[PDB]
DNA sequence: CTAAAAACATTCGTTCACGTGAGTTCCAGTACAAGTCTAGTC
């Protein structure tokens, strides 16, 4: 909902991460094992990444759609991190 | 020549000064993680 109160939450996140905000939303709404291997991962921001230097909004939803549908809580965590690009582990490149 | 007094020798308990080993705990230093780096218009 647009009004509901996980809409709210994620909009208004105070722009406590938005993405500890999506996994708690996600944990009750999503599946608990997924099945995209490491590879499907990186083809799928390959394309959301040339999408988006063309122009094109509709293959990026879908395939934020598969991602969504076929990842855990955690792994949608974790991918919304690195989109974010702001990977926090406590352990520096070095 | 003998007795009394003074001096010397050894032992014992106590206190003080230092030195040295061992066990426990605190702390000052060092390593590392993370944030910041100017401000605005179009």
Same mark, same amino acid.
């Given at each position: 909902?647009?009004?509901?109160? %996980?809409?709210?939450?994620?909009? +208004?996140?105070?722009?406590? %991460?938005?993405? /500890?905000?999506?996994?708690?939303?996600?944990?009750?709404?999503?599946? &608990?094992?997924? $099945?995209?291997?490491?590879?499907?991962? +990186?083809?799928?921001?390959?394309?959301?990444? $040339? +999408?988006?230097?063309?122009?094109?909004? %509709?293959?990026?939803?879908?395939?934020?759609?598969?991602?969504?549908?076929?990842?855990?809580?955690?792994? &949608?965590?974790?991918?919304?991190? /690195?989109?974010?690009?702001?990977?926090?582990?406590?352990?520096?490149?070095?």
């Amino acid at each position: 909902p647009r009004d509901g109160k %996980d809409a709210l939450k994620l909009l +208004n996140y105070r722009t406590g %991460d938005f993405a /500890m905000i999506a996994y708690f939303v996600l944990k009750p709404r999503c599946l &608990q094992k997924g $099945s995209l291997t490491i590879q499907q991962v +990186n083809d799928l921001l390959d394309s959301i990444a $040339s +999408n988006n230097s063309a122009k094109r909004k %509709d293959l990026i939803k879908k395939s934020l759609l598969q991602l969504i549908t076929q990842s855990s809580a955690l792994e &949608q965590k974790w991918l919304i991190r /690195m989109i974010i690009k702001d990977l926090k582990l406590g352990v520096s490149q070095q």
